Amino acid sequence: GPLGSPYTIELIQPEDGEAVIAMLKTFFFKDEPLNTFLDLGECKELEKYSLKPLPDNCSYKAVNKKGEIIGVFLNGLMRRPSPDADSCEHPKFKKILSLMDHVEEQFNIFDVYPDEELILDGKILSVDTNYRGLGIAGRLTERAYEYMRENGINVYHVLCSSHYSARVMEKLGFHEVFRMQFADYKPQGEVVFKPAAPHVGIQVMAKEV
Numbered sequence: 104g105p106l107g108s109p110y111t112i113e114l115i116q117p118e119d120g121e122a123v124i125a126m127l128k129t130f131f132f133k134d135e136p137l138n139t140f141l142d143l144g145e146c147k148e149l150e151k152y153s154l155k156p157l158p159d160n161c162s163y164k165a166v167n168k169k170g171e172i173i174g175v176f177l178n179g180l181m182r183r184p185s186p187d188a189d190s191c192e193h194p195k196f197k198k199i200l201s202l203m204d205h206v207e208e209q210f211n212i213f214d215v216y217p218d219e220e221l222i223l224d225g226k227i228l229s230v231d232t233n234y235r236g237l238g239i240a241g242r243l244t245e246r247a248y249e250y251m252r253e254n255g256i257n258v259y260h261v262l263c264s265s266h267y268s269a270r271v272m273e274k275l276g277f278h279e280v281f282r283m284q285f286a287d288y289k290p291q292g293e294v295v296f297k298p299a300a301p302h303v304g305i306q307v308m309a310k311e312v
């Protein structure tokens with residue numbers, strides 16, 4: 104069973120795109136809480152969204168003895184915003200993107216870390232259901248620390264839409280620096296998202312490595 108089983112942690116390469124997408128379609132596309140709530144289904148926009156940060160060379164896969172991807176954490180570099188969703192044609196993903204834009208409008212991680220210019224952003228985290236509860240997500244997260252140290256990056260920022268991913272980060276010493284309860288997210292005056300308990304809100308997590 105999964106409990107005894109070895110896996111490696113490896114850098115995700117460009118040619119890994121299709122394998123990453125196939126895994127995410129089985130898992131993340133269906134079981135990330137906002138995706139679950141909306142019943143996302145087929146979503147090319149999220150596929151492209153997931154592939155986008157790969158060239159930053161700081162995304163990692165967990166791979167079992169059969170050579171199958173059993174977990175991923177896709178990360179990209181994020182830069183201090185300057186003062187200076189709309190083109191998304193997938194109606195369900197558009198709502199998710201709008202929420203993400205809203206969080207950014209309400210909270211700027213660079214205000215918490217005024218001396219930082221570049222921060223690591225943990226964008227997509229997914230572990231095969233069969234292998235959950237083994238700390239794989241934590242292993243994937245810790246792998247990025249090596250990248251951060253090599254590159255003089257001090258802060259790892261992870262926006263969580265799951266209470267379970269928030270727990271992964273909490274175990275690693277990330278702190279929740281901003282919360283937006285789904286019940287309070289009322290653009291145009293009405294609740295857009297009501298995901299299943301215990302997923303009560305967006306939990307923005309930050310680690311100073």
Ligand SMILES: CC(C)(COP(=O)(O)OP(=O)(O)OC[C@H]1O[C@@H](n2cnc3c(N)ncnc32)[C@H](O)[C@@H]1OP(=O)(O)O)[C@@H](O)C(=O)NCCC(=O)NCCS
Nearest residue numbers: 134135228229230235236237238239240263264265267268
């Ligand atoms: C979030 C996720 C990546 C965690 O991966 P993981 O490798 O299982 O992480 P952990 O082993 O540290 O488990 C974290 C918590 O998940 C919870 N959990 C949820 N389902 C579980 C299950 N099937 N098995 C065991 N734990 C589970 C546990 O509360 C656990 O906390 P604990 O260590 O205090 O018991 C995984 O649950 C997942 O893929 N969820 C669906 C996609 C998603 O929501 N991604 C994050 C969006 S921000």
